[PDB]
């Protein structure tokens, strides 16, 4: 059935109450919420005049922002409404935030690290045998031989064509360690390099 | 970024034409302003502004100059008064529309705001045509002569026409003076010169007197129903030397 | 039709309650809140008594303290506070708050980037380049060669006359650069300045 | 009208919504909510039970805590639970919140300020001539002129009769200005005193 | 009356719009939750169903977790949970919270201070000695002389019975006088000890 919107639609989003102009919903008409509110599908109310989406509801504020106009979120909620962007099938919100530090940064360095696929399947093992080697053991800390080569050891990073040499993939290797919460230092055992992580 | 530029321009023309033409707006005033305030955001206030002059000249150069034109003879002080109403309150509606190009485009430009631009137009085409010009002229030449003679007419129609006239001009005395104070001052001193002589003929010393008093009274009278209060005086001094100097 | 508003004014800002008296939104003549409010416009209403105004309503607690009083934002709201004011076109509003300090050092600063009408122009594209030469290269960091003179080179600052000396237009950049998010040094190849930007 | 309250106040304070009872809002009988709820005045509800006060509400919970006991603020809202109760006119409150350290200190040095009548009108001078300089000369620093004398420049400061010194003047003038957002390095030039201020 | 309340007991305190099961408040017998839904006593509801009690309800979310299972506030919401049990009369919840750091330490504090209980008049004493001399003189700091022994003085500290040193008790003025937002700085003049306040 084709359904009639109210001007003014109030919205449900995961318990969170939105209130927006139906103008600001379609304001894109290649969205989720343009697509959800074209009138083409039915959308089911929630035991008031309210409107539900359910999902989380603390960053689609900024969704709205953008939306009523082009307002970008601070640099700290560039993520979380990137995901809400993501979900909801926003381009030009997905392009603004891709032109935006926290997320420009890491599509320059995924330039790099995606001349490697293999590239988090080898974090994941490094972490996971360095976990299994201080359970079985029962030590603090777990010390474990990595193989870098740019052109005996349980994880290693191949060949790559670019310009970032080997230390700045073992950069990499610390800083996303390191972003998982890991207390990792390396040193060159002799290329062979040794991660101990301290588990605590 | 230009298409949406466009439609919300066709939206944004569509009310400013639909409030015009004195109907219920389909859309709200937020949604307008937010496209006004977007469109002035971006640098876009050149063409909202420029389709602003636009609409305006349609409905006042196509619309009620043709009307004037047409209604010359056809209570033209009314269809004069009712197109000044009607213009100040679209042009108070659409200024409240448009209030974020007041508080930064217009005064960048140094230009007048979207009323005084309003009444600069008003002033500009449909006070300062020839034809237009002569023939309010002549009304009001021929109100102030009925007056004078005895004949009755709408003092507040006079009034209003006089409001519209002073108001007209940019905080200004000038498009009154040049409309119509002129031709009123004239008439007035050609009605002095003519009554001077015929009081001195029929009247006495002491009955010329009190029929100079009495003119002045009654050009005082008038003044106060039907004329700006601040053109009075010099009226008066002329009349009181046309009366008795002469 | 001129609409009759009650004495208390419920308001509803994009999803968020608030509720003021009719005086406050009319104390100044000419603002967006008093010209919504003077009953010459039909306002919507969203399911209850609330009036609809399509904006968020994070920082419009601000504005309703200016409006009932003198009170004036805190320092880290003094720039929200002054995006709603422009939008709510609340002149004294917006002459107190560029009287406030995050505010009045900006203009005391575009004083002199006024001079520069190219001045965010050539950012962009010094980031742009730098964005492009780290994504081609597949490296972290990009180095790029500017040109500064106040009376071979990607992005040259053209002459000024003012008493700010070249090094503060260095100054400027690495500030709104490093504002951005962005790692910044610069150096003086030899007058060219080179300009490396850290990636990752 | 002789207003009938109920012995449980639901309240509205700028759309925040508290709930009181009666014997707490008339606890102080010389209180601005003691005469607005003593029934000589009549009170205007807002779409419900609610009575509407247009003020702000994010910082009444403390009042209404100090009303329902000798309770206060903790150390972080002293001075903005010192003006809700400067508005609502609670002599107690106002009281114990000047025994409180933010305000204490601040009326201690106001003893030293008071001899001295034309000091802030001597820093908004200070500050609008920095300005002034600063944008006509297109700089980012200012530098003025200033004579502090105990017993060509710019900013004068007369004399006082304390045992506070110079020094101590000049610690106030310093500090206000760093309050006031501004970067202030006073130097003495040789009693007038230089002082550059930093705008970017 | 016998009141009869619904086994979903909704809350309103101060405000602050909880639910909760009537077998959660009357879990603990010689309480202030249990005494007043005993059902003995007749409870005022606030025009929408909800039970009304005029107190804080910033922290009795705590009190609730721990009336329905046995969890803990965080170390930053033990002191007031502490003063929001104090008023429930919640007797386990109080042995818990004086079983926790914040506490704990004052405890074993106020066992030293216990053979003083002049203690904290003396620190107000100390305070408004220095308040009124620093005001009186016109100063920013005021100096005053106390004693401290363990077996022409503003304030004297007599002897106590314990294995604290001298040094320890000056260890508890600094400490209770910088908690209370003073700058304090002591010396032994020569046994009499010159505290030092600065006010600004």
Known sequence: LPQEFPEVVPLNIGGAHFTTRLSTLRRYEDTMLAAMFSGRHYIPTDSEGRYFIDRDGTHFGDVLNFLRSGDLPPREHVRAVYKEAQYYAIGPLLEQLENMQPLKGEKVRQAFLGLMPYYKDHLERIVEIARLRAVQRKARFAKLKVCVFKEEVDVSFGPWEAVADVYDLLHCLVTDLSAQGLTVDHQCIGPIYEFKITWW | ?246
């Open chain 2, 1 to 246: 970024d230009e298409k949406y530029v466009n439609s919300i321009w066709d939206l944004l023309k569509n009310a400013i034409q639909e409030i015009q033409r004195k109907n219920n707006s389909g859309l709200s005033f937020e949604e307008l302003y937010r496209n006004a305030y977007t469109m002035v955001l971006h640098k876009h206030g050149e063409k909202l502004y420029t389709g602003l002059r636009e609409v305006v000249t349609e409905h006042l150069i196509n619309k009620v100059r043709e009307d004037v034109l047409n209604s010359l003879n056809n209570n033209f002080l009314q269809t004069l008064n009712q197109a000044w109403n009607d213009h100040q309150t679209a042009m108070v509606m659409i200024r409240d529309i448009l209030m974020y190009m007041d508080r930064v485009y217009v005064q960048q430009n140094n230009v007048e705001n979207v009323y005084n631009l309003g009444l600069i137009i008003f002033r500009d085409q449909v006070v300062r045509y020839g034809c237009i010009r002569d023939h309010l002229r002549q009304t009001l030449l021929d109100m102030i002569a009925r007056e004078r003679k005895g004949e009755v007419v709408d003092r507040g129609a006079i009034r209003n026409a006089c409001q519209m006239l002073m108001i007209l001009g940019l905080e200004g005395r000038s498009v009154y003076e040049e409309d119509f104070e002129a031709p009123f001052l004239e008439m007035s001193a050609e009605f002095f010169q003519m009554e001077s002589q015929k009081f001195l003929a029929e009247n006495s010393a002491s009955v010329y007197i009190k029929k100079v008093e009495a003119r002045i009274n009654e050009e005082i009278e008038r003044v106060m129903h039907c004329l700006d209060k601040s053109t009075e005086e010099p009226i008066v001094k002329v009349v009181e030397r046309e009366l008795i100097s002469k």
